[PDB]
Every structure is written in structure tokens, then in C-alpha cells.
């Protein structure tokens, strides 16, 4: 496979997934306070 974007996309969404997970739980906390 195209190792570059293949692995980079994994790295991409791994980062963005922890980000969306954070922001989701964070915006929930925004509803808390």
C-alpha cells in the first residue's frame, strides 16, 4: 500500500478521534458549567 498516507491517515484520525472525544466530553462539561 501507499505507506505514507495509509499510516498517516491512521495517525491523523487517531489524533482527531482523541480530539473529538475530548471536545465532545468537553462541550458536555460546557453544558455542566
Amino acid at each position: 500500500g501507499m505507506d505514507a498516507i495509509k499510516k498517516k491517515m491512521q495517525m491523523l484520525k487517531l489524533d482527531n478521534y482523541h480530539l473529538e472525544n475530548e471536545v465532545a466530553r468537553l462541550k458536555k462539561l460546557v453544558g455542566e458549567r
Binding site: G1, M2, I5, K6, M9, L12
Partner: protein
């Protein structure tokens, strides 16, 4: 090309032509698989 290191040549020639077709097939499906990137 002659009876010296022609094996390397023939080997590589067939190898690289396969890689060429396989890499074309690769980039096509590689990006197509990730319709969700």
C-alpha cells in the same frame, strides 16, 4: 545486455513492470478504500 549480469536485468525488468502495474492498482484502490478520509 548479454551473458554477464543479464539475469539481474531480466529479473528486475519483470519485477519492475509488475510493480508498475501493481502500484497503479495500488494508488487507485488505496485512495478509493478511504472514501471516508
Amino acid at each position: 545486455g548479454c551473458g554477464k549480469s543479464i539475469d539481474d536485468l531480466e529479473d528486475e525488468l519483470y519485477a519492475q513492470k509488475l510493480k508498475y502495474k501493481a502500484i497503479s492498482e495500488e494508488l487507485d484502490h488505496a485512495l478509493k478504500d478511504m472514501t471516508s478520509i
